[PDB]
Design a protein around this ligand. Structure first.
Ligand SMILES: Nc1ccc(Oc2ccc(F)cc2)cn1
Ligand SMILES: Nc1ccc(Oc2ccc(F)cc2)cn1
Ligand SMILES: Nc1ccc(Oc2ccc(F)cc2)cn1
Ligand SMILES: Nc1ccc(Oc2ccc(F)cc2)cn1
Ligand SMILES: [Zn+2]
Ligand SMILES: [Zn+2]
Lengths: 351, 351
């Protein structure tokens, strides 16, 4: 089974990283134990959607391509290592984002920096090490692979796009013309930048490149299958599915039982959609209550969202995405029914 | 002049990075201005010792190698880009380290995260972008270069060694056997881990790889001159000069007029050297006062250092380093008098 193989590769990669720290970086057993716990706490516990997508894509191509058994094993092992590079990249994002946002919990457990023996002083560096480990993995396991150059180049472009996206996200409640390192940033009063196009730019860069584009393209790279696809279509379908995924996360932050998007004045799908249909009085009530810690004001915003019938707007949004995704999957079938099926599976798991 | 060329390349690299953000990352003019100011504030103002070392090494080889004028220009341009990759890597370290340590000032100016319109929320991400820019630079300017693979591999090993070193440094006042993410870390009471070998490990990883090894090896890589050297000697001389550089920085933190190493209980050269010669009563007075914010206790520690005649220990340390560096430079002369002269210049600038 794919998951059994994926989890076995984690144990192998962890042992490699920790043994390398001992033989080449003069690490002592106690610091190796601290890093082992850090790696387990930050990398494990999720559903492994991103890492498993690499494995599923590679498995698809193995079913329709002739290979010796040793080659099939090498491809699957490469897909598992590539998948862990993405999972560790996500771990890096989550550790740093939780510190930047002053988050409390991450998956019903305290954020890494909040652990008593961690603290922000170590946690920022722990997040830096998580990302360095993605590169150590790549250079060690893929040293002689023909796809090494393409995989490293794609990985840094995705990483940089994600960092740019984090900047778009954290500055989404500022008026762009007021951005200035010398002057403390006031929250927007007109909310003129809370538009569908601006929201789409935040989501595209902060989530879609690493959650959807990177796992799909890595699966193609380790399979030596980039010719079975039109890269403009892969990008188009990844950004579309990714946007839908973030819209779902935005809805959950507000309505799923234990989120601080309202208090943080985030440019969420809910605030943008609400502002796109609100009358003069509703806009005024939104402005008087948004981006405030006061629970009474948060309740006013949630109530405005509830009475605005945003469930109908979400249903219409969902219908349009289902429509466009189905269209892109059909266009993907021209060059590869195998790859189009992997995308269909990713969509099913998202939808 | 080398410095004029180096500074002209900064303007070219900055324009490239910001133009790429506009054409490929959908950036708006205000966010591009914020990133331009961030880049200037974090990357400029220093002596450019690390970046200029790449240029000086390349200039040395140009004087003894036959090349067309266009090739000389390409090599110098590559040395300048490589030098800026190191300067931006340093900028990344300084931004993140200043946040982790809660530092106030950096070169008589507030630390980046302390700027009113920055804050920790943006500054951690700004430091991440500084490092991503080193990779964007490499992939764009060195895309067709034969040294691209070696340069990227060397750069990530150095970066990872530096992150490991930061961990060694920030945990240097903890008892290793007590390291535990679940338990708040008490400061050491016996100071058994304040030894020359442990101090040497901190310095080797936190400073020497990126300050001395990386600029020297990058200069060799852009010059296609790795055969003019024995890499074991380059590593040995880089770690030796690097250790001396950190010992100088440790002395300055305590005695150079405006440092918090004493209050932070850092495993500095001064604390290690003091403990290596102190009697029973002096050790007890050190333990009762070290790692405390109280200015009265800091003064007791400085006084213990002053009466311990650490200036004589520094003079004896300096004499041994001068001796060993001269020896290594002589061993470097066997394969390259040109490279040995560049190392002699680096030593002169350090000493
Ligand atoms: N797999 C693994 C776990 C921990 C580890 O750390 C060590 C450090 C110094 C030693 F001397 C021995 C072990 C090395 N490898
Ligand atoms: N859920 C999420 C939020 C933000 C994100 O992007 C970054 C995170 C930390 C960073 F340091 C840089 C980018 C990725 N995922
Ligand atoms: N050299 C440079 C400086 C700033 C910059 O930012 C822009 C963003 C969006 C635009 F439409 C125009 C410029 C681009 N390049
Ligand atoms: N002066 C100095 C201190 C520490 C240092 O290393 C790091 C810094 C930040 C990091 F996030 C990781 C490593 C480099 N230079
Ligand atoms: Zn965030
Ligand atoms: Zn520090």
């Amino acid at each position: 089974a794919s998951m059994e193989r994926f989890l076995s590769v984690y144990d192998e990669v962890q042992a490699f990283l920790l043994d390398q720290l001992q033989s080449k970086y003069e690490i002592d057993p106690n610091r190796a134990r601290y890093l082992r716990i850090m790696m387990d706490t930050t990398c494990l516990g999720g559903k492994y959607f991103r890492g498993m997508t690499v494995v599923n894509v590679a498995e698809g191509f193995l079913a329709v391509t002739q290979h010796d058994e040793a080659t099939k094993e090498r491809i699957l092992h490469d897909a598992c290592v590539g998948g862990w590079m993405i999972e560790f990249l996500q771990a890096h994002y989550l550790v740093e984002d939780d510190i930047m946002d002053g988050s409390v919990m991450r998956r019903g457990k305290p954020c890494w920096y909040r652990f008593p023996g961690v603290t922000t002083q170590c946690a920022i560096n722990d997040g830096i090490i998580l990302k360095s480990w993605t590169q150590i993995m790549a250079w060690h396991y893929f040293a002689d692979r023909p796809f090494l150059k393409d995989l490293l180049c794609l990985f840094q472009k995705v990483d940089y796009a994600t960092a740019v996206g984090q900047m778009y996200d954290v500055t989404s409640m500022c008026d762009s013309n007021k951005l200035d390192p010398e002057v403390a940033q006031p929250m927007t009063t007109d909310f003129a930048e809370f538009t569908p196009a601006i929201y789409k730019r935040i989501v595209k860069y902060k989530t879609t490149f690493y959650t959807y584009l990177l796992p799909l393209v890595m699966g193609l790279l380790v399979s030596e299958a980039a010719a079975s696809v039109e890269m403009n279509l892969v990008e188009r379908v990844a950004h579309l599915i990714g946007e839908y995924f973030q819209v779902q996360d935005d809805v959950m932050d507000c309505f799923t039982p234990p989120g601080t998007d309202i208090e943080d004045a985030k440019c969420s799908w809910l605030a943008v959609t609400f502002l796109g249909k609100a009358n003069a009085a509703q806009v005024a009530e939104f402005k008087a209550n948004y981006g405030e810690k006061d629970p009474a004001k948060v309740a006013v915003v949630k109530r405005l969202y509830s009475k605005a019938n945003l469930q109908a707007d979400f249903a219409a949004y969902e219908a349009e995405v289902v429509r466009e995704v189905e269209s892109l999957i059909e266009q993907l079938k021209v060059k590869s029914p195998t790859f189009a099926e992997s995308v269909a599976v990713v969509w099913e798991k998202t939808h």
